[PDB]
């Protein structure tokens, strides 16, 4: 009795239609009860009930029963939501024909017109045959919510949703491979499509939500290195404002800015401090947020020997004068072998202003021998202004602040340049990005449009380790992944000249993995005992091998990147030749691939891309594919997330058979197991990893994490060649 439709015209309720819909959705699921759902939603029905509401109600009801004991509610809820969205976009369950759709969308100005220019009507007709609209039924409720929330093309004001998952995927493919010769184009299109729609390859949000639409902005994070000059500060700041406006995460290197008290122009003026400028970089970053809060994240880097280091370290400590506080930015302290050595011998650390010690800053990253040489020399030189601190106090203060906030990050510069793809003398890595996984070379700007500056970019993607059956499937995946990302660099726009320079010069990529924990659980391994060490060595060998292979093949076809000659790769040096030698004591897995045959091929034909792998965290991307986040172990068997439409629940993949194989985050006794796996991964990764450190106060006497243990874990990490250190989770149930 009495329902109202979308035109707002009354029809009577037919309660068996609803039933059928539910009945259909439940197909193949175990432990879901249609009755249960009917009961909980029928009671909320009323005369004059809009149809849309009817769907919302059953969806929610189904969704509210998601649990560890009945995980298939995830799919029952999802399908019902897929169905609803189908009707919401097309007016019927059946999606229109690709061509008609594109045409309409192009006319409405939601899709790029170039699509109709690049592909013929017949071509679209061919693509349509690839599409399998039934793949939409494999999504999990949490995934569908992400899709509906930030991927699908819609009108945010009105709430109209214009497309469905499969069209997204096929058109993303079409755009990325649109310049390919007609004799291969569509073969790639299909292959890519299959890879991404069956969750083998995962793509970042910017790409998924934008590629196929009129926009050209697709980079998520940027790296800017700032010079020690008002001209360069200004330029830097300008760049940041440009990039944060396009929702990009920023990574700033402000280590060269001189110290407070330092002489300016002669003796005519004395420097004011770095603080004042850091505050100015903060305002730049938050320039396009609501008030000065929402969005725009940045991570600032500085050497640990900077003269102002003690004032920089406590920039987040809430308890202090506003004047000496830059609270809304994360910081990365740069450390090298010498610094740790001073700590172990219990000696002192000498702090200097970059300006007063010629050649020290450069040596710090590029040559440890020379760094040491100059560092000692300047220590004695009495003319140099300097200040001594106990190694132990400095380290303690940093760890303290790291522990308190969890946002004081570490970057081992020496490791970053001794075991990298680049030659430190020509292009050293001197900073990282927001989430500490990118390591690329940068050169400071002297103006926003300065053509000789360099700004690195994050071009990302990831392999789903839960979706491949054997490591030899990576060969194909690598081919698609490297090829679509390489084409994207030539497709997207570059606001600042310096960002285009690096992008075209070196064509750098950052491909990592998702579902690592689940993958280990399937193989019956755990993080903390070292049982996964040899499997992880074997897995990451394959990944890096096939990525390098794919880039090399592309190089033959389209030519190596212009600045390929600055890489170590160009001099016949591979990741297996420069890794930290202590790794040999924690893993004996042998190399299964022909690295020598590849060594030659790279030397001869070069690489299309200078960097290929990087292990980034991934919240959104993992949800769509119902997977565990990046390499991290899951916090619990059910994840909870709040939304306007209700509480979102997502159950770990294959809980039903693997609940006992999983090792949850706080089940680990310590950080050793994880830290070793991280180090083993770094042997083959071209760039860096977003490694975390986790501590549970309940396992310590009096609920207080010992300083002895924080330094212990810090040194361990360095010993196994870890390049960077991200969050520090300190559990508080």
């Amino acid at each position: 009795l009495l329902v109202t439709k979308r035109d707002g015209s009354t029809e009577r309720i037919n309660l068996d239609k609803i039933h059928r819909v539910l009945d259909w959705a439940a197909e193949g699921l175990h432990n879901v009860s249609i009755s249960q759902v009917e009961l909980r939603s029928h009671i909320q029905f009323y005369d004059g009930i809009k149809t849309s509401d009817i769907h919302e109600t059953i969806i929610k009801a189904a969704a509210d029963l998601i649990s560890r004991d009945a995980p298939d509610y995830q799919y029952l809820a999802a399908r019902l939501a897929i169905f609803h969205l189908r009707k919401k976009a097309y007016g019927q369950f059946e999606p229109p024909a690709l061509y008609d759709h594109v045409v309409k969308m192009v006319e409405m100005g939601k899709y790029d017109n170039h699509l109709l220019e690049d592909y013929t009507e017949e071509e679209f007709k061919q693509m349509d045959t690839f599409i399998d609209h039934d793949r939409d039924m494999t999504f999990s409720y949490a995934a569908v919510k992400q899709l509906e929330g930030k991927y699908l093309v819609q009108n945010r004001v009105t709430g109209e949703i214009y497309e469905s998952a499969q069209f997204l995927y096929i058109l993303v493919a079409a755009c990325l491979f649109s310049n390919y010769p007609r004799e291969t184009r569509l073969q790639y299109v299909k292959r890519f499509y299959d890879a991404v729609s069956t969750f083998k390859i995962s793509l970042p949000t910017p790409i998924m939500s934008g590629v196929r639409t009129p926009t050209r902005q697709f980079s998520s994070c940027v790296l800017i290195e700032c010079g020690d000059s008002l001209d360069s500060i200004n330029a830097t700041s300008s760049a940041i404002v440009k990039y944060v406006s396009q929702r990009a995460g920023i990574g700033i290197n402000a280590g060269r800015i001189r110290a407070l008290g330092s002489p300016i122009r002669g003796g005519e003026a004395f420097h004011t401090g770095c603080i004042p400028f850091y505050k100015h970089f903060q305002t730049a970053v938050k320039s396009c947020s609501q008030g000065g809060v929402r969005g725009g994240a940045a991570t600032l880097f500085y050497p640990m020997w900077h003269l102002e280091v003690e004032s920089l370290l406590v920039l987040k400590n809430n308890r202090g004068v506003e004047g000496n506080r830059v609270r809304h930015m994360d910081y990365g302290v740069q450390i090298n072998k010498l610094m740790y050595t001073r700590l172990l011998k219990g000696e002192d650390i000498t702090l200097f202003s970059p300006s007063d010690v010629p050649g020290l800053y450069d040596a710090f990253f590029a040559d440890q021998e020379e760094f040491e040489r100059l560092y000692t020399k300047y220590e004695k030189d009495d003319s140099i202004r300097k200040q001594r601190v106990k190694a132990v106090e400095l380290f303690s203060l940093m760890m303290q602040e790291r522990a308190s906030t969890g946002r004081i990050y570490i970057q081992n510069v020496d490791h970053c340049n001794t075991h990298s793809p680049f030659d430190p003398a020509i292009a050293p890595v001197r900073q990282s990005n927001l989430c500490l996984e990118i390591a690329l070379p940068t050169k400071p700007l002297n103006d926003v449009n300065d053509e000789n500056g360099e700004i690195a970019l994050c071009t990302l993607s990831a392999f789903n380790l839960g979706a491949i059956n054997n490591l030899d499937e990576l060969e194909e995946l690598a081919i698609l992944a490297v090829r679509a990302l390489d084409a994207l660099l030539d497709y997207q726009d570059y606001p600042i000249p310096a960002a285009k320079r690096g992008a075209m010069g070196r064509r750098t990529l950052g491909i990592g993995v998702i579902n690592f924990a689940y993958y280990l659980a399937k193989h019956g391994k755990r993080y903390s005992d070292g049982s996964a060490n040899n499997l992880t060595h074997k897995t990451f060998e394959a990944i890096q091998y096939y990525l390098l292979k794919a880039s090399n093949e592309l190089a033959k076809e389209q030519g190596a990147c212009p600045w390929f000659n600055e890489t170590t790769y160009a001099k016949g040096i591979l990741p297996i030749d420069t890794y930290k030698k202590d790794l040999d004591t924690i893993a004996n897995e042998p190399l299964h691939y022909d690295w020598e045959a590849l060594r030659e091929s790279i030397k001869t034909h070069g690489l299309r891309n200078s960097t290929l792998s990087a292990l980034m965290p991934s919240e959104t991307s993992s949800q769509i594919s119902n997977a565990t986040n990046g390499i991290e172990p899951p916090r619990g068997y059910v994840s909870i997330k709040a939304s306007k439409d209700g509480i979102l629940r997502q159950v770990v993949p294959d809980y039903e058979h693997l609940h006992d194989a999983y090792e949850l985050l706080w089940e680990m006794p310590g950080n050793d197991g994880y830290l070793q796996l991280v180090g083993i991964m770094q042997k083959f990764i071209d760039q860096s990893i977003s490694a975390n450190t986790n501590y549970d106060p309940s396992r310590f006497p009096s609920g207080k994490v010992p300083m002895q243990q924080l330094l212990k874990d810090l040194l361990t990490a360095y010993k196994f060649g870890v390049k960077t250190l991200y969050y520090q989770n300190t559990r508080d149930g």
């Binding site: 190089a555 390929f564 070069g606």
Partner: peptide, 4 residues
């Protein structure tokens, strides 16, 4: 190949 390798640029030239």
């Amino acid at each position: 190949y390798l640029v030239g």
